[PDB]
């Protein structure tokens, strides 16, 4: 209809018409590219979140939108945000925006860390939930590739859900190698050291590093490695971990990357307990294992779940995995704008009336 509008201005938050089902005028924030509002779901009789997506002018936006929709519709897990509904025109010709309806969450870990100290009990629970969700993701052979506090939503009872699969990919360790200083898209402060050295981020260890950075951030309310540019990120990491060992260096076969590391002055490890003097010692042991330089030696998700820090929560029978891996195209690079729009239309069909009387 359009009978509803939500305080427009910048972005383009003119119209927000989400059929008759959803009826309230409460803006929340700005998505990657569209207003997010809360609304009353007149069917389930609860407030929900709705993201307006207007992706159809940029190939990158469409790609990320399709990737996220395909993934979220296939995943079903307590610690991963779901899609409850998708609102769009009934034909491709008329489709100009897409609205994604999701459970309403109170906040995200970014906003929470800006103003709230976390108890060790909250840190432990939040880490548990992140890892529980990540187990499922990885079990589907999917890498999230952009884990960070703003991608972790929380409700009023501290239930945590991972969001934003726009940069996700299917794991491909056999094709992970690349040259030194290869450009990378995911958020700088949460990038593993190998991204800057010799890795395209196509293995599960990339996500464990990000989780380790999030744990550190929870312990002190500050990002642990706030690089200001691409290579600064690596110097922040080495400033705390110290210089890599001969064995870990020998693992980096690429000469430019090797020689860069060899060119650096020797740095000694900064002990975790001096960075985080109020932290639980078991938390720091787990942190150390997640923030391991060598990605091959880095802890895997399931090992992390089994670590003593998380013993109060660990229960592998209640930490589900995906029914089968994804092998769908997540690169989506060789598709014209017309095919991407068509795939988004097809992927969202299940939510249409389409066939009523
Ligand atoms: O995407 C969401 C979002 C998604 C949900 O399912 C939800 O329940 C709450 C959300 O809040 C946001 C707030 C923002 O400032 C920006 C956002 O992108 C979101």
Swiss-Prot record:
Record-linked Gene3D superfamilies: Phosphorylase Kinase, domain 1 (3.30.200.20), Transferase(Phosphotransferase) domain 1 (1.10.510.10)
The reaction(s) this protein catalyses: L-seryl-[protein] + ATP = O-phospho-L-seryl-[protein] + ADP + H(+); L-threonyl-[protein] + ATP = O-phospho-L-threonyl-[protein] + ADP + H(+)
Modified residues (Phosphotyrosine): 184
Coiled-coil segments on the chain, per record: none
Molecular function per GO: ATP binding; DNA binding; identical protein binding; MAP kinase activity; phosphatase binding; phosphotyrosine residue binding; protein serine kinase activity; protein serine/threonine kinase activity
Required co-factors: Mg(2+)
Residues annotated as domain Protein kinase: 22-310
GO cellular component term of the entry, any: cilium
Motif TXY in this chain: 182-184
Result after altering residue 315 to N: In NS13; results in increased MAPK signaling; increased translocation to the nucleus; reduced interaction with DUSP6; no effect on interaction with MAP2K1
UniProt effect for mutating residue 71 to N: In NS13; results in increased MAPK signaling; reduced interaction with DUSP6; no effect on interaction with MAP2K1
PTM field: Phosphorylated upon KIT and FLT3 signaling. Dually phosphorylated on Thr-182 and Tyr-184, which activates the enzyme. Undergoes regulatory phosphorylation on additional residues such as Ser-243 and Ser-245 in the kinase insert domain (KID) These phosphorylations, which are probably mediated by more than one kinase, are important for binding of MAPK1/ERK2 to importin-7 (IPO7) and its nuclear translocation. In addition, autophosphorylation of Thr-187 was shown to affect the subcellular localization of MAPK1/ERK2 as well. Ligand-activated ALK induces tyrosine phosphorylation.
Keyword annotations of the record: Acetylation, Apoptosis, ATP-binding, Cell cycle, Cell junction, Cytoplasm, Cytoskeleton, Disease variant, DNA-binding, Host-virus interaction, Kinase, Membrane, Nucleotide-binding, Nucleus, Phosphoprotein, Repressor, Serine/threonine-protein kinase, Transcription, Transcription regulation, Transferase, Ubl conjugation
Disulphides: none
Ways its activity is controlled: Phosphorylated by MAP2K1/MEK1 and MAP2K2/MEK2 on Thr-182 and Tyr-184 in response to external stimuli like insulin or NGF. Both phosphorylations are required for activity. This phosphorylation causes dramatic conformational changes, which enable full activation and interaction of MAPK1/ERK2 with its substrates. Phosphorylation on Ser-26 by SGK1 results in its activation by enhancing its interaction with MAP2K1/MEK1 and MAP2K2/MEK2. Dephosphorylated and inactivated by DUSP1, DUSP3, DUSP6 and DUSP9. Inactivated by pyrimidylpyrrole inhibitors.
Residue interval(s) of motif Cytoplasmic retention motif: 315-319
Protein origin, superkingdom: Eukaryota
Domain notes: The TXY motif contains the threonine and tyrosine residues whose phosphorylation activates the MAP kinases.
Matches recorded under PANTHER family: MITOGEN-ACTIVATED PROTEIN KINASE (PTHR24055)
Family to which this protein belongs: Belongs to the protein kinase superfamily. CMGC Ser/Thr protein kinase family. MAP kinase subfamily.
Protein name: Mitogen-activated protein kinase 1
Gene: MAPK1
